[PDB]
Amino acid sequence: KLGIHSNDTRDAWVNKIAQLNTLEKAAEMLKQFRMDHTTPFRNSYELDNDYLWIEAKLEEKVAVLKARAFNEVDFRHKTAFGEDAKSVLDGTVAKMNAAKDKWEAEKIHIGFRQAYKPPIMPVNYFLDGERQLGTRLMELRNLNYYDTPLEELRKQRGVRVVHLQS
Amino acid sequence: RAPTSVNAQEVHRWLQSFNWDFKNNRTKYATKYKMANETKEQFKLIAKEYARMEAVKDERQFGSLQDALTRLNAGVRVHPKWNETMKVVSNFLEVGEYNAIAATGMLWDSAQAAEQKNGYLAQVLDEIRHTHQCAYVNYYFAKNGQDPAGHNDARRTRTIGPLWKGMKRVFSDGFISGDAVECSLNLQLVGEACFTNPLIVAVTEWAAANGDEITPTVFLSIETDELRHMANGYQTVVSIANDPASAKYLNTDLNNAFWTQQKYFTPVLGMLFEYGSKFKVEPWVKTWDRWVYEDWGGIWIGRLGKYGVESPRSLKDAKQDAYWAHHDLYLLAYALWPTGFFRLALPDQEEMEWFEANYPGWYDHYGKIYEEWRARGCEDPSSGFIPLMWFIENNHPIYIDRVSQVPFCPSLAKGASTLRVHEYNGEMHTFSDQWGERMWLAEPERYECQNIFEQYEGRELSEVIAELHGLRSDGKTLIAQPHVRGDKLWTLDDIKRLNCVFKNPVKAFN
Amino acid sequence: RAPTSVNAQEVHRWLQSFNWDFKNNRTKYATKYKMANETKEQFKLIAKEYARMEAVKDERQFGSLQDALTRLNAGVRVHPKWNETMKVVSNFLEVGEYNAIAATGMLWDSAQAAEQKNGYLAQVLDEIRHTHQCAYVNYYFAKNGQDPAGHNDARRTRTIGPLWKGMKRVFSDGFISGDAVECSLNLQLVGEACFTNPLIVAVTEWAAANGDEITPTVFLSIETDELRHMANGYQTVVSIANDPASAKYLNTDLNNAFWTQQKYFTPVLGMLFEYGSKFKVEPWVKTWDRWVYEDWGGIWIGRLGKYGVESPRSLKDAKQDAYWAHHDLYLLAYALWPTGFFRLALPDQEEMEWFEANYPGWYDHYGKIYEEWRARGCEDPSSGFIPLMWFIENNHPIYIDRVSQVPFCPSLAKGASTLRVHEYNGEMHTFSDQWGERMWLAEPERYECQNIFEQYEGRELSEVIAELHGLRSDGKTLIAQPHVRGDKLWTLDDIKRLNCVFKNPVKAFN
């Protein structure tokens, strides 16, 4: 099976996901899945064609497990890992505002998304963070956006220039 | 005791005061700019009066369609190539109209002045209207036209092809993903002002020339709503002018917005006009220089110079590449005809003369190639030939720009032939220009869009088409075709026989 | 707490009980019948729902007209002959629709049953709509057409010619002057059922054949309201079927009604279709037999048999005079062209062939005459010739029926040639048929209509035209013309130079 919307990889993960029935286990796997398969800093590009869909499936399980495990207050204010959502938000924002350059900034924003994206962090706190983090990141990035020559920007990013054509 | 009442402007007089102050009365979206608290809107409307002026327009519009136009059998008496073009034109526009809804809701959230908010609000409702209008155009051509397939399921069959990916960049993601202002520049300042407003109009011209009276009826009505949006866009700039950040960022965001849109429309609109029509209206080349250079990149853009706005620094390159872009693209569009949801056609003899006349050198390059493909039997199902094969034989790989999603064949193109390939964290990326490259190098996490080769890798052609429902109601005939005639239409099996299997061209690089 | 409302059918269920009995609760109009007070109407409508179903129709209609049709320049790309024809067709139907308002008002007044009164009331409103719709047709062609004169002032210029007098007999006076029931028959049982309804649709046919998409858009909409009127008229017969007086008078008024309506439409309608168009749709003889015989006189009338309704005893007489009726009339119409408010055109080679093919013997009579007239220069102002002169030369007197007002020429006609002349209390009277003769002998005071010869007697032609504004804007060129070309238009002086004076043809018997 190698389909676009239905294939073996997705099926295998669906089965893996059904065998999660503890919030702590399911949450840890979602955070791990994200470090392993999302953003351009993913540990591997092996699931590039199915990670998006698979991740949603894993999220679905972490959400259902969190709603049954948490009381109403914790659901509105704690991360799936038991941290105080607001403390995480403020702390991360604090780190962002103290970032020296746009390179430190991107690591802080992307790192935040891989670790706290819902159902880990309640969406209210998460989107509020998206709002603040994104702002600084753009402020640092869009400053003098064309002053660095492509030759150098490639070095700064750290790509392996494989081929060019003038 | 004389008959009196209240109109829209009398209530609008106090609209601005509706918003009040409180700690968290602030935008929910990230942004480098601060939209001024006292910004004002141009049109003094309220919900009730807005509804009345649109309801009136609808009457005329639907009245025409349901009555006179239907009796005249206008849904049929349209040139085949144009019936197919509207499948793309209308559905693709539909998505731009749709995302503009979410786009203007994001601007309404950004705006702090009740009047600026209200200005965007009107557009929010206009875009819903526009979404439903474009939907109707396809709904109408499906129920009454010479070929409903494509018109009746574009919303799912458009996902098969590569031109769809690029449309989502400029008309979907480009409108809603980014700094609220960057989105406004993509959608309004550049989008509507430079391309769409002039485009909606031009389409009714080309439409009229090819026997289509259905599209002018609807689009001309869509066109009456653009004044407010042009205004909204203009005001976005005004609302951020007296802000320090505007000086450090505005021009950078405008430049990126300009290149983003231009990258897709320059080649695609020109392609739809000249290759998707029988009767030509005007050579795309001059249409462009008038729109982009004169009207927009001079007149409209210069009127905004008083606010620190400058001419796009990439305008020169855009111009340099423009000339052959659409011709280079139709070659790829036709070669990959089995991936569309529309039927294509080779330029006929009369068209080749027009292309050569208006584009000296057209024949020596594209002309001869199209002539070799028909010789190879590209129009014939039994030939067992698809232009794609010619590309493999002559070693002309086709890549997908990781940023704009626009397909390009650098070894065969007469226009831009640049190609940049990079490796980063175990992934390969292909770029066709220097502007798109900076965008990625600087904003990697924003452009992780997987292309058709990556998604379809290892899959046999007919299997991809089948999975994604690229068939007609007979369940065997392809929606897409390499000719617009009514006989000898290819079937899934004619493709299965070719046994073509997708492979990622970037993999060849060590 | 479930959302609820009430509809028209639910309020109409109690509509019959609305009328209460009392002293003078009787019709204010003379009649020999007694409409049953328990009579029901076929449609269960209340004012507000009627308003809605009509408003919806207007939307389609006016939208098509203001939007698409205007954009296709529909009011122009119509054949000249047809443009002139709609001046008559539209404005003449207008008066019929108009007098129909007073007619149903008088019938609404006649009915005692609330339901029957209600049905008539709906027609009262429909008729008002049709008056406005027909007015709109002329209004639209005036504003956007190739020749506004006539279309723009037909309400006053129509008074110059003799064809108008005949129209008033069947669409004005015949609808309101007389026994409420006799009027009903003229208007509904005969008029609407046998002629108007079929013709409304026929018009759209001939209209579309000649490039007119305007008329179809409006007339087809009018057509949709006719079913109700068919019902009103039908219920009228029912209302009186029981009354003993019915079996003693019905058939008489019905015969008089039929003869009255056919006496005009038979000639005029066929003439308007065959001579007012370039492209033909169907020979009028055939159309006439299907309508007047099968459809009406057969099907329709048959269903009213169980109510004591017998086929018009004048039916046979009608089919006899009919065959050449319209051809005979156009000769007269063209010869008297200076008295119209429209431009006439003589048959071209194709039409003469079509005419001969469909009416064997046509050329040897009508054809040769038109060629003589044309060769003599009836179309050229400098020839100093007007066909009326040819009638004098060859001694072919034109009379006006004192009853039907229809113009006839006994010594020339290929159809009926009978002519009865009488003198009474000092006045001369001319009749064209036995039925009309009876109507006069029996009811002298009903018919005292001065004909054009009596009123204009002694006047010089150009003077009558000038006094009644038969001129175009420049104040010199005549609204009426003997050809439909753009050059060499006849002026008032070209008419005065001829110095023709009106004469009362009946005095030749003194």
Next chain:
Amino acid sequence: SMLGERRRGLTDPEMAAVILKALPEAPLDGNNKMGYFVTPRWKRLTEYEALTVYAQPNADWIAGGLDWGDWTQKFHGGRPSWGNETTELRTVDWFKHRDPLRRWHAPYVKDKAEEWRYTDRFLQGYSADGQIRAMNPTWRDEFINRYWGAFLFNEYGLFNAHSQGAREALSDVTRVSLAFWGFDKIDIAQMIQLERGFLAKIVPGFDESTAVPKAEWTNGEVYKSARLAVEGLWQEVFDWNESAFSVHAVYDALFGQFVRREFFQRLAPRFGDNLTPFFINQAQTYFQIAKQGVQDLYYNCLGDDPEFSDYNRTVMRNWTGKWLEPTIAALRDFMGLFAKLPAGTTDKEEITASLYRVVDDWIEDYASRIDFKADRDQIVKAVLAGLK
């Protein structure tokens, strides 16, 4: 087929070619304004006038006609289709009238169609929002079902009084207005029934039959004198103008405006009824609409006629007197209804407040236009003599 067997001259290549050939190089007349010869009432000619003025084929002998000669067919006896003889009033031109709202058929049904749709929505939300709860059982089941219901016959009767005018009107402008005034009246009666119908759907034992109110109207004593006034205005007047005039500028301006506004409109709130008021709302607007036309025809046009000003006024002051009495008699009898209200519902000081409002407006909008000197006190006093 897909193309259709029937060919059209606008789209058919062959036929269109022939048509395009026959066309002139330009319009054969620049005057593209239909009705260009009509004397505007306002700045520029309106669509309303163009599509209406002169549609009636009257000859010059019927003040304002453009045609000549006599009718082609008349009544047995000689009676003309339309003749100056159907009305006492005289004028220089019967086409002078102009509906201030300029309503021709299209606008008319458009506005009413919107009201019909709105009415449907309103009624739905009213029940879905359970607002019926607040209404008083006595008022509902008694004053609305019986006395408001019985008023539908009053309205139905005024409607029927228009029948003859629809036939005898002497101009298109007066006919369309008259048709519309009458048509609104039948609308009102139907709305009255529409409510009794609605309640019957949301309230268990409520009967939508017309049995009750019809009996009240034909037998009751509260509307007795009203019913008589109606039967007269409808079936005893043969003069279309006297009918329209006496119905809109006298009888309905008094009795009608009182019963609708001063009684049911005023008290409905005091019984938790905001339903009836929605319909009496439409009825009051319709009244305002007709009034503007009624004023233009009988005051601006006839009463102010350049040659029959003095004449017409006399005639109208005459009809006003002729019917001002039967009207008052209709009101007096109606006063007897108050004695049926639950004690305390309303005192005598109020009915008098409303009675003066009605009479005052009827003098400001009608009587003082023809100069019919009337005593506001004497009139109210006479009506008042109808209470307990």
Next chain:
Amino acid sequence: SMLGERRRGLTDPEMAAVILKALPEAPLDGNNKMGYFVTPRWKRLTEYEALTVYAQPNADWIAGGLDWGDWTQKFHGGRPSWGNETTELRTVDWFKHRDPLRRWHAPYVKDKAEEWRYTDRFLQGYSADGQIRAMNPTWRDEFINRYWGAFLFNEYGLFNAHSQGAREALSDVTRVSLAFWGFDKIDIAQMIQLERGFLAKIVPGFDESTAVPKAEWTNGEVYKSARLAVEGLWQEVFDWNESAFSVHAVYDALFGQFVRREFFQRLAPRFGDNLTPFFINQAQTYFQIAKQGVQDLYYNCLGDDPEFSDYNRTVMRNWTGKWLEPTIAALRDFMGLFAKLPAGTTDKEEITASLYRVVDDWIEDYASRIDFKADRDQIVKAVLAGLK
């Protein structure tokens, strides 16, 4: 010229024949139903579903998506254009929702358009008929101008709460419903201002400036907790479903209904106010129209979702509890308004009863749908503590 310069393919003989020649003998596919692949909510596919469902290019990783792959361009940081992360709710398909009224743009603007013109006519009939004569001055100058006028800010706030949802909604059908629910609120706020400006026209000295009403809203006591709840619902909620749910299935179903129906609409009569009830009837219809969509979306599609039914009800139960308190507080502060009414206007029993009406309808129409355990006595008494 007369024929123009541009030659059209439908009417130009030469071009038309070229086109007609290229045409197939018959449609290349007999399936002429656009949207034929969409699962109908009813008997047959509707124009509303056809023109709306799937316009949103969601990939399969957003429940119900037909497309595939990541967005082409995301936000700085990586946030997707649209994603599962913008709301706590989960479903099997975001395209399941159907506006029971099937409203797409055309029908929506057409009804509002009708209502606009009906409103215009209503006011003209209201001022011309001089109905302002019956309204009590103090109810007009204090309660309507100040308190009803302040409520316009409440409705404006609820409107703005919809901004994020217009941008974040995960489907076309929800986006359209959401957009229409919001537009209806700004419309009501505008109607409140439309009435004040109308009064300023017919009542001497009446000031239409919003300074007074707004001063009431931002600094008065009657609406203090109301404004706090509104400010919270609007700017402290980043989840588009919590915002739409809490606003319509909690705050407005309780506070809004009480203020609009149980206070103003219920007391206007007792003060001869027939004007305000007119606009409140619209707001109530709007509330009823929106409710049907709200119920379908949150109870029928998400609350009854085959895979997340239990999860979603827990979340909405959570949200109801989170927002029920601020709403009770808003009602509690509003109780202070009754002490301002002229003595004898209403009593503690009527107030309590209306409170039970609003609370009982809420439990039946919303609370019960998600098994939220609401104690009607507890809620009401918590509110009554506000009666001064």
